[PDB]
Amino acid sequence: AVPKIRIAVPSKGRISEPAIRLLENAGVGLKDTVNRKLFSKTQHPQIEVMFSRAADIPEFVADGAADLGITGYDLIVERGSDVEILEDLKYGRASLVLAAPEDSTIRGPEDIPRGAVIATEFPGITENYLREHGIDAEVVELTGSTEIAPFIGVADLITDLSSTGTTLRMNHLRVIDTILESSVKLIANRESYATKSGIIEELRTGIRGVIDAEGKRLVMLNIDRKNLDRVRALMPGMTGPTVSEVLSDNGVVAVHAVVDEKEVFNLINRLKAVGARDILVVPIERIIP
Amino acid sequence: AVPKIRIAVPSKGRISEPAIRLLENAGVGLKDTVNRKLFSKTQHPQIEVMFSRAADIPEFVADGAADLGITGYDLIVERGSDVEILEDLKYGRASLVLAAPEDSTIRGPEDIPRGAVIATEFPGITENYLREHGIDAEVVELTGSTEIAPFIGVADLITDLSSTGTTLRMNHLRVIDTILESSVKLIANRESYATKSGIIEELRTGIRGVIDAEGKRLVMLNIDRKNLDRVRALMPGMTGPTVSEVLSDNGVVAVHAVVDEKEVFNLINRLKAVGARDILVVPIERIIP
Amino acid sequence: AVPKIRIAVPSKGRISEPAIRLLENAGVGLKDTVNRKLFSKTQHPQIEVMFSRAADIPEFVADGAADLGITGYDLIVERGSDVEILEDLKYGRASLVLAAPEDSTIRGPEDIPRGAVIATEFPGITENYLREHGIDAEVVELTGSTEIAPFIGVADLITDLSSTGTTLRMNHLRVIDTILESSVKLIANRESYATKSGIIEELRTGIRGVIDAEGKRLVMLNIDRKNLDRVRALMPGMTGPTVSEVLSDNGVVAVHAVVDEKEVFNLINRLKAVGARDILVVPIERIIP
Amino acid sequence: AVPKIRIAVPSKGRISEPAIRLLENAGVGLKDTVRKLFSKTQHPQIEVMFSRAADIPEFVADGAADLGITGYDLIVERGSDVEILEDLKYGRASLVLAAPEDSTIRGPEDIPRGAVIATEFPGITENYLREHGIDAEVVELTGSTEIAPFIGVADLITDLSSTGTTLRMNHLRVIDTILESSVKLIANRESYATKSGIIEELRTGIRGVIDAEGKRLVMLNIDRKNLDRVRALMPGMTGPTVSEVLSDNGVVAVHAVVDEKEVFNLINRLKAVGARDILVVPIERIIP
Amino acid sequence: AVPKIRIAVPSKGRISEPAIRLLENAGVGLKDTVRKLFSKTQHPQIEVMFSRAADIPEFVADGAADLGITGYDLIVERGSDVEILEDLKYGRASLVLAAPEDSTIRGPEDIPRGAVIATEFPGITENYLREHGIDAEVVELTGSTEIAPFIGVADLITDLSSTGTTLRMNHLRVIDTILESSVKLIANRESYATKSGIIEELRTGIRGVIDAEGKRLVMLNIDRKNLDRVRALMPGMTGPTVSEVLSDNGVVAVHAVVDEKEVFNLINRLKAVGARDILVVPIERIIP
Amino acid sequence: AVPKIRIAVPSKGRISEPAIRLLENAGVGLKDTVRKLFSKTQHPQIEVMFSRAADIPEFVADGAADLGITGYDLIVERGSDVEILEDLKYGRASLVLAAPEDSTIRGPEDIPRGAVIATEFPGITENYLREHGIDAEVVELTGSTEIAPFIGVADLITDLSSTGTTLRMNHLRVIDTILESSVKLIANRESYATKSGIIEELRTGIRGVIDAEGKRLVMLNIDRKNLDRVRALMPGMTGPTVSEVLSDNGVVAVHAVVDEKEVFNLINRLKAVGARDILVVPIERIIP
Numbered sequence A, B, C: 001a002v003p004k005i006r007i008a009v010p011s012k013g014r015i016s017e018p019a020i021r022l023l024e025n026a027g028v029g030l031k032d033t034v035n036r037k038l039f040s041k042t043q044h045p046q047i048e049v050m051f052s053r054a055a056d057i058p059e060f061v062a063d064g065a066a067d068l069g070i071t072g073y074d075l076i077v078e079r080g081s082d083v084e085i086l087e088d089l090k091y092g093r094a095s096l097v098l099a100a101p102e103d104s105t106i107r108g109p110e111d112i113p114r115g116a117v118i119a120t121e122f123p124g125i126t127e128n129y130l131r132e133h134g135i136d137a138e139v140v141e142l143t144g145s146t147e148i149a150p151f152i153g154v155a156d157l158i159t160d161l162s163s164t165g166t167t168l169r170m171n172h173l174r175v176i177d178t179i180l181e182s183s184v185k186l187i188a189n190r191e192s193y194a195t196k197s198g199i200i201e202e203l204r205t206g207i208r209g210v211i212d213a214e215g216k217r218l219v220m221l222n223i224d225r226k227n228l229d230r231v232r233a234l235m236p237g238m239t240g241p242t243v244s245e246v247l248s249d250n251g252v253v254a255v256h257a258v259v260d261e262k263e264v265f266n267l268i269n270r271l272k273a274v275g276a277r278d279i280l281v282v283p284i285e286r287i288i289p
Numbered sequence D, E, F: 001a002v003p004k005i006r007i008a009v010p011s012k013g014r015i016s017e018p019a020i021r022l023l024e025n026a027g028v029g030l031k032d033t034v035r036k037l038f039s040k041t042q043h044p045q046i047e048v049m050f051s052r053a054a055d056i057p058e059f060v061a062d063g064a065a066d067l068g069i070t071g072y073d074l075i076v077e078r079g080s081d082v083e084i085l086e087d088l089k090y091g092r093a094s095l096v097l098a099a100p101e102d103s104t105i106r107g108p109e110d111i112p113r114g115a116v117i118a119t120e121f122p123g124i125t126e127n128y129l130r131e132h133g134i135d136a137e138v139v140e141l142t143g144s145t146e147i148a149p150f151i152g153v154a155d156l157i158t159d160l161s162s163t164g165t166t167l168r169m170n171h172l173r174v175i176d177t178i179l180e181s182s183v184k185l186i187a188n189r190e191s192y193a194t195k196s197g198i199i200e201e202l203r204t205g206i207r208g209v210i211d212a213e214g215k216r217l218v219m220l221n222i223d224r225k226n227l228d229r230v231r232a233l234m235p236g237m238t239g240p241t242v243s244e245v246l247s248d249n250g251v252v253a254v255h256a257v258v259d260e261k262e263v264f265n266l267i268n269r270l271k272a273v274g275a276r277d278i279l280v281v282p283i284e285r286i287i288p
Ligand SMILES: N[C@@H](Cc1c[nH]c[nH+]1)C(=O)O
Pocket: A236, A237, A238, A239, A240, A241, A242, A256, A257, A258, B220, B221, B222, B246, B254, B255, B277, B278, B279, B280
């Protein structure tokens, strides 16, 4: 009769909570989720959530155990899983870098000698990076804590996943190359997409809408009509500022416009200097241009 | 002089966090909550919160240790506590079902023989269900994990609490009846209500308001005036769409209406096809019709 | 070229999460925060977050390891750290009280004898309180659980941090004085402020804006024009209610005003009695008057 | 052919780790546990089922487990038809009836009609009022009965203590003892009559461990001329064991079973009589 | 001068605490651990590096650790060039191939072309299909292979069990055994040829502990006139030890090494022959 | 009548479980603990109060606890007026003064005026600068002093290590040792003069455990004709114990106290001299 979809959402780690929050904002929040449950209903009667570990999501989606998944690009690439990437989700960004003991000769990938050992949690991506750059080096897979590998003599070099070079400087390591830029993606099974594109695009519009709302707020203010002109030039908004009557002693209007977070501080000072008062910043859940 | 109320809120489990979020949205968020504290102030000077385990809340409220409580209907029924139910809170929904090993003869309650053993966490509800259906069966109370009871030979049948039949299919069990539909309730002591109805109805209005806001968003768009008519028919809203001037090159208006989440996706496509742009979905915390 | 700032934010305890939420609401939410990271980027390219324990934040800020910090006033005072207080953050309020075994002679600080022992987690503040009140009493520093100290014979009196006297009454203790009122503060290094005041005031405006939004919501309603006058007197708002056209059968207008949470319940009943319908309470993230 | 037995063991709480340690000491330790739900042991005929202690009385009576290890309080609360085989001499606790210290009630006889008692053991409590002829309500809590008076849920509580210190902190006074609890080894009656051999083998091991508690083997070197005075000082189970030591003098080695209670005084006595090199060596099991 | 050795020990999982207990029993316990990443032991020449069990085979082969303690399954999965020194007789588990119970597949020979097997050991599995000549896909999971058929990720799973009970719960049937696992003590080849003395010293300690498992010293008092029948009843490692007891009769004390398996029957035999005061005393290490 | 004593024991950290194990080995283990705040022990006259290790020095000096078990570093930091009774030979750690590896400072004498030292032991540090005559600031942190230079909070740190490995990871170099720490048994002076009997009884038990560390009872079977060479090979505490074995030849059993350090060499010696069936049996306590 009517098709259901299952979306694979990380159960633990950094990706998990923001993925739950995004679905919530997309109108597809978790519904009546009992604990000890691997599956959960959502606010949409045709969408369920499967809690899966993040490294398994590429495969679950490739195989069709889940129609859609939310996971990291690094994991998708490492598995080499056969999946369609639908959207970049603009969170969970991290670089898989190649790093060396700061006192090392090696200052760039050109310096890596035949016998060099590299410790990694991502042997697939790392072998591939080495193969593409033609470097002959050995790759040792570790469970974690690659940062310790030079210290204990397992490796000359490491790979590592970071937003800030800080955990690297702390272990006295220097980035000598970036192997991969990673971000969280919404992915899809191909067979699922061809047969269930309505509901899929429905969730995709909801999610895509939340992403376009990022760093966008609705700014409202009361202005005396004599200054309404300078407020136009300051708040162009999406098509133009929305202007409404205010019941007061002066000819006061209320002006609303969607504004980006990059612009709000300079705008506030520019608005106040023109006679704007009662400046409100109201949240926007979804934008569809 | 002036009356204080104490509301019992679950401390752990699935009910806990959403109850805290609901009070927050009702204007009664937790205020300055020190850890290791069994009590907490709220944003309202006359409302305090007592952190109680969910199964104890019916009794705390029945006895008057708490004026009000937020807990599950199953727990209220199981205890048979003497309390007034004020509101259904529309979350934490779950069915207490009667289930059998999938390969069993028993396909419905009619098939249960004299000597049948049923394992449960809810002996009260279960005895009562059996008594009302006239079935002679034995009831064994377990601490948890009733799903394992047939496997280890303790029981022929089990009861279980689920939103999805998934944890049941996983243990190879089939639902042969639904015993009780459960949902989270706001409850009240009777003596508390008669003597403190002002503040109680105040919290009740706040909470009731958050529940009516569920699946309701405020949708805003910019439309060229030539198409303002088709937007009326698409966005009836609560009384009618709110229309405001936009300062642009064309006669553009801005149109706002409260819309239900069931309708937003079809609405978006219907709006875009009519010339609507810059579609915003803004959250609504409380609705009072 | 351009200056970066580092803000010290508590990593564990009651202060932590609300501090993260406040920055989020200020437009400076945590960005791409990898776990096991002591530092994190934020939504602002010039602002980073250092996760620090709350008692260490005064010193980190005094010394310049962090430009700014969010921590409790009690901790700032106890350390006696040299820092500039920028804003009170209006959460995490607690009183450091002096308390005695309820059956004790001591009913006020005047009754404390020469040899009296006071157990505390705040010896600095406590010595200082004693020194200012001229009382000769001994101060014993404990790791925690000062509430047990009279019971085991370590102390006659204790200090304690509470929003509610409940944890004190439970251990059968009575407050005999308040030593210090504590609240969460935004603080700053002096050298950081003189050299990086632009970006600092930018974050300060963002944060200050979120604090002024507390207990303030945007209330919207549909009213028939014949009753628009009584709605003026009920919703003065910031300058005056914003009034917009509604496309319906009657001359209906829509009226919006910023209202304080203290007034919403009485307002709702007053609005309904005048013919107001479809009352919406919409959240406001930031107010800049 | 070969009867196998299942023993229900607590999976969490304070009964768990000591019960597991008890089986280990009895020669039937957890073998290659992948803790879990079912574990193998050193004995081919014995398997452990990890269970919630409150459920163990039921699992045993219904036959899902041949044997169990759980608290007497839980056995009585369930009302489960099980055979108590052995007292395990640990997890002792009294289920007491308690009143607020500022209460007039000092004993069962002071409890007025309609008093409310908060408890985790509603079956035990209702029965206690019916054996004593007291007309009072019973209210069941998940835990923290200590806090019920303070919040106004009950006038009285029951609680489970071995030291009255939790009660003393929360300003509560013991007015009676309802039941004395200790961890028991229990048996399914049908399992016993059909598998007595293997049950008795584990029973003996388990009983041997309990009978070794606080017992030590004391060993010392002494010159031959003082051997007569050691004799009196430590009688042991039957008498002290003697062996020749190879050294310069006529040194002998003397060993005996001694109780912890005796050891300090005994050491002093032995030292004053010329004994040196005194060893205390553990005994896992004793069978008299 | 003085060679020092590093032994990689699992920092979490079920291999961890028993390995640490094993070193303690071998006279090389963790000393003043501030557990950590590197710890001192009772032996000046020995230091522990806490490591993830999956990494230990690599740390050992590459030379970052002279010795390790990790599962055979992990050693084979890594394919690490290490020397297995000793079997440690714990953490036994079979890596089995399993099918849904409602599956037609009962054996390796029933596996149809293109069947999908979910596993945590993709190297072991791929090799198993290549030693048996089976054309099937392999899919690697982080864990919970038991759930893969139910969700439709695979037709078959591998799993690691000592009791088939997890499999029985999730309605799965064992169709073959791929590998039998046990915890091993492993060595770097270069470390052995250069530090054999200290390695063999720890090896002996460790081997002595394993050879003591399930062995006890049984001790009893008996009258001299029955000493002949004890002899037959417990042969011990060579024969029972006898010493004079000081009491009233002609009482002697008799001691022997006995296996746990024997102890119950033996106790009965000894009791029927007049032996009393029977003690079971632990043995930490045995070296024949 | 009957004096009772309270002993403050750490409730968490690395001092906790070994202290509890120490009391158990001393014949005064935790009895029926419902861990808690107050526990009973095997001794009627002894009760345990679980406490934070940092508070134990105060609880003892002020008299809330007669005895305690806590780190020397914490005792000195408090400046608490307590009697140290016994060294407990575990939880050893040095409080070191450390500099960034890329620092010019190699010793105390290199520390320039106004240098900032981050520490968890501000009392110990301030005193160290005043015993050495160094003009430097002290900044107190909750923990993670290792990270203070990297973030720019201090030029120097103090830290508490037994292996310099945490320091080596965070690129820090030890420049001096401020204090050497070990876990102590401490006493209230007033408690000692009034309850010396019971205190000394626990002291002896506790001291007996520490003196047993690394000591074992070695036992072996040998033919009578080789008994002379065993004598030389293991002198024991006074000399080896000998008993007749019942077998076919003239076999005797020989036992002695031996140190862990000796055991490997000794085993080899005994094997070469014809000794077989070598047992290592634990000793809980030794009193010379
Ligand atoms: N007219 C304003 C606000 C708005 C957008 N859409 C609806 N209203 C803008 O274009 O930015």
